[PDB]
Amino acid sequence: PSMEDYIEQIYMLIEEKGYARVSDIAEALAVHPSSVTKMVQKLDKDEYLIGLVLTSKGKKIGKRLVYRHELLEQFLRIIGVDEEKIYNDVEGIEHHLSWNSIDRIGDLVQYFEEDDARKKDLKSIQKK
Amino acid sequence: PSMEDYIEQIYMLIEEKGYARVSDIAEALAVHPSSVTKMVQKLDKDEYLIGLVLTSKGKKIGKRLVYRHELLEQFLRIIGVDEEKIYNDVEGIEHHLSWNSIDRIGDLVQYFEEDDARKKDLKSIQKK
Ligand SMILES: [Co+2]
Ligand SMILES: [Co+2]
Numbered sequence: 001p002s003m004e005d006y007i008e009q010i011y012m013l014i015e016e017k018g019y020a021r022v023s024d025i026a027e028a029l030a031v032h033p034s035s036v037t038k039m040v041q042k043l044d045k046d047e048y049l050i051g052l053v054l055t056s057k058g059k060k061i062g063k064r065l066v067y068r069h070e071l072l073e074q075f076l077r078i079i080g081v082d083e084e085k086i087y088n089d090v091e092g093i094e095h096h097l098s099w100n101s102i103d104r105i106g107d108l109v110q111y112f113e114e115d116d117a118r119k120k121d122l123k124s125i126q127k128k
Numbered sequence: 129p130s131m132e133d134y135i136e137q138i139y140m141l142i143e144e145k146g147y148a149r150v151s152d153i154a155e156a157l158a159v160h161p162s163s164v165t166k167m168v169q170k171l172d173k174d175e176y177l178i179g180l181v182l183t184s185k186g187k188k189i190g191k192r193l194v195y196r197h198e199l200l201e202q203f204l205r206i207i208g209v210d211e212e213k214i215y216n217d218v219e220g221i222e223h224h225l226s227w228n229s230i231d232r233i234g235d236l237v238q239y240f241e242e243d244d245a246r247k248k249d250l251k252s253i254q255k256k
Contacts (some may be wrong), residue, residue, distance in 0.1 A: 079232045089229050096220025104207045104254075111253045118246075125235045125242075 004065055004095050005029060006039050007048055011062025019051050068094050068102055075105050078112050078119065080126055129157055132193060132223045134167055135176060139190025148180045196222055196230055203233050206240050206247070208254060 009028040013020040022040070026033045043049050048058035072090040081089065097105075112118050137156040141148040150168065154161040171177050176186035200218045209217065225233075240246050 076229060076232070079236050081226070081229050081232050085226045085228050089224065089226050092224025093221040096217065096224070098209075098213045098217055100213045101204060101209050101217050104204070104209050107254050108207050108250065111250050114253070122236065122239050125239050126232070 001029065001031060001035070001039075002095060003039070003043065003046075003048075004061075006036075006043060007054075007058060007062050008065040008069065010043075010049070010052070011054065011059070011066055014054065014062075015066075021051065065094075068097075071102065071106055071109065072097075074109050078109060079122065129159070130223055131167075131171065131174075131176070132189075133157060134164075134171065135182075135186060135190050136193040136197065138171075138177070138180065139182065139187065139194060142180075142182065142190075143194075150180075193222075196225075199230065199234055199237065200225075202237050206237060207250065 006025070006029065009025055010020045013024050013028065017024070022033050022036050026036045029036075040049070040052065043058070047055055048061065049055060054062060069090055072094055073086050076086045076089060077083065112122070134153065134157070137153055138148045141152050141156065145152070150161055150164050153168075154164045157164075168177070168180065171186070175183055176189065177183055182190060197218055200222055201214055204214045204217055205211070240250070
């Protein structure tokens with residue numbers, strides 16, 4: 001329920017529907033609409049947003065958070081984590097990693113994405 | 129922090145000094161010693177320990193926890209994360225990862241360990 005969680009979901013709802021309803025934010029984050037209203041005011045005072053609209057500041061952060069999430073899902077998928085486990089692991093770790101780690105994981109994903117033989121060799125290890 | 133953070137540090141202190149003083153735990157986790165005393169009583173209720181002595185259940189968990197920490201450090205090191213950032217990243221993510229992710233990270237570490245050309249090739253993508 002951090003500021004980052006809220007901005008992440010808000011950004012996504014705007015990308016999905018064109019707007020972010022309080023009730024949609026509430027559902028997405030499994031919190032009561034009261035909590036949502038509280039966070040909105042803080043987000044507004046810290047100028048992440050102004051229905052509700054993200055400032056360029058909020059947009060940059062939202063875009064980054066969605067990037068981080070997708071990257072980390074891709075990372076765990078590539079290394080062979082059971083698909084069903086991936087979402088909860090990503091949600092758990094995404095806010096705790098330094099940009100340095102995100103970027104190195106980014107490079108690692110790129111490393112596997114550029115020659116399928118590498119993915120096959122990784123798979124071979126798991127077999128042992 | 130969590131029960132796991134406590135068990136990790138307690139197991140470490142026993143490995144290092146032969147015993148775990150409340151004051152050493154408090155210092156290790158940067159928490160108030162009053163918090164420790166209360167946390168210790170809970171670990172006792174859940175039979176992770178009984179001075180402070182880990183039960184077989186507590187020793188098994190502690191060994192796993194230390195293993196998890198070390199593996200995750202190796203992982204971030206191998207993919208080239210700045211050394212100074214590694215510890216804080218590991219502390220943040222370690223109790224949020226499923227065993228499946230840990231074990232796949234283990235396989236990934238093994239992948240890089242068994243052929244140095246893989247490390248070299250990864251170092252090259254970083255230069256792009
Ligand atoms: Co996420
Ligand atoms: Co640790």
